Amino acid sequence: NIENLFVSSVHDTNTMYDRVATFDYIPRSNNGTSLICMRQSGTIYRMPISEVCSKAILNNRNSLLLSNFENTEIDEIRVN
């Protein structure tokens, strides 16, 4: 029942504007992520999280397969 935690991966995202005091998550559709943030001056804006590709494998048929760090779906670039 007890799970000994350990850090697997660290993902760095730069905000749109600097000097941010606090932030908060936004639950998006299709397991997306956006960050609503409040600056040191109290201005509130919205910083989206980029869809960073996790794995880009090639193929014998020259087909590219793309997997993302955020959502579930897998992108495929066929050769036709």
């Binding site: 000994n4 935690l5 350990f6 850090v7 697997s8 991966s9 660290v10 760095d12 980029s50 869809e51 960073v52 590709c53 996790s54 794995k55 880009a56 494998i57 090639l58 193929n59 014998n60 048929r61 020259n62 087909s63 590219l64 397969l65 793309l66 997997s67 993302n68 760090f69 579930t72 779906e73 897998i74 992108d75 495929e76 670039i77 066929r78």
Partner: protein, 307 residues
């Protein structure tokens, strides 16, 4: 660029093609393995089997060569390596299609990467986790594919990494049928090429220099017949390092850097080669996948950028 949804309930950690290219297996963080096939009629990916495999998040799977049958490895954080063989007489999408074979518990650490050997060394296997110890598993008995015996055990790091500090491990085998057995092993900021000596035990043969930060992907370029071999390195920096390894301890071998591109402005997560070692697909932190080819010179130049 048509997308298909894998149907996982969590993150997708590793996707690998099979030998023929018509099958993909997608491991995930919801302790499931889903195997997809390519229908020749509908021309769309469809699920073949989905089953709960491990007790933690699965981070690496790898297909075995089809001369050994349909065997899928699976390394996860619960310190287990589970090997799955497909039953031909079983229903589609049932969960009992892939039969469990072995659970290698010799590793006292959460694993990161599993890689099958090429089709000239045997039915070997490699594993690396947060323990600093490399483990090789050979299936020496062709009659039954369940007596997976540990044969080599080399320590890579002096101590296991800390609980909180992040670290990555990746493996890449050398698919040359006419060269001594080599293994490209990445551990944190170190990338080492092992080699099978005359005594049957691996030794440190050559170390790739550089690598100021964490190594996220090592891919050995397929030995198409050239006199030089290539290793692609995706570091936590922007650097996609390509190393030209020339071989001439049976044989001495030299490591020379061929190219070093900062064309991503972030962490390079996955770098992978083609069938012939001509197209290099690098995915980085900018959200764009950059393809690389060599034109009129040995130095690799950039090409089409997919975002």
């Amino acid at each position: 660029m048509q997308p298909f949804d894998s149907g996982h309930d969590d993150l997708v950690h590793d996707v690998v093609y099979d030998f023929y290219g018509r099958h993909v297996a997608t491991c995930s963080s919801d302790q499931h393995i889903k195997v997809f096939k390519l229908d020749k009629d509908t021309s769309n990916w469809e699920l073949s089997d989905s089953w709960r495999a491990h007790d933690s998040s699965i981070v690496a799977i790898d297909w075995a060569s089809p001369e050994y049958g349909r065997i899928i490895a699976s390394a996860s954080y619960d310190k287990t390596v589970k090997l799955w063989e497909e039953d031909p007489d079983q229903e589609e999408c049932s969960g009992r299609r892939w039969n469990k074979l072995c659970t290698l518990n010799d590793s006292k650490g959460s694993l990161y990467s599993v890689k099958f050997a090429p089709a000239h060394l045997g039915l070997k296997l490699a594993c690396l986790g947060n323990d600093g110890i490399l483990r090789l598993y050979d299936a020496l008995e062709p009659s039954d594919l369940r007596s997976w015996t540990l044969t080599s055990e080399m320590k890579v790091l002096s101590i296991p990494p800390a609980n909180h500090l992040q670290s990555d491990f990746c493996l890449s085998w050398c698919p040359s049928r006419f060269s001594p057995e080599k293994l490209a092993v990445s551990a944190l900021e170190q990338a080492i090429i092992y080699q099978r000596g005359k005594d049957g035990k691996l030794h440190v043969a050559a170390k790739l220099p550089g690598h100021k930060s964490l190594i996220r992907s090592i891919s050995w370029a397929p030995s198409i017949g050239r006199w030089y071999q290539l290793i692609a390195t995706g570091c936590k920096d922007g650097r996609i390092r390509i190393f030209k390894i020339t071989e001439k301890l049976q044989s001495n071998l030299q490591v020379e850097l061929l190219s070093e591109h900062d064309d991503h402005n972030g962490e390079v997560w996955s770098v992978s080669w083609n069938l012939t070692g001509t197209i290099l697909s690098s995915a980085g932190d900018d959200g764009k996948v950059r393809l690389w080819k060599a034109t009129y010179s040995n130095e690799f130049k950039c090409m089409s950028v997919i975002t």
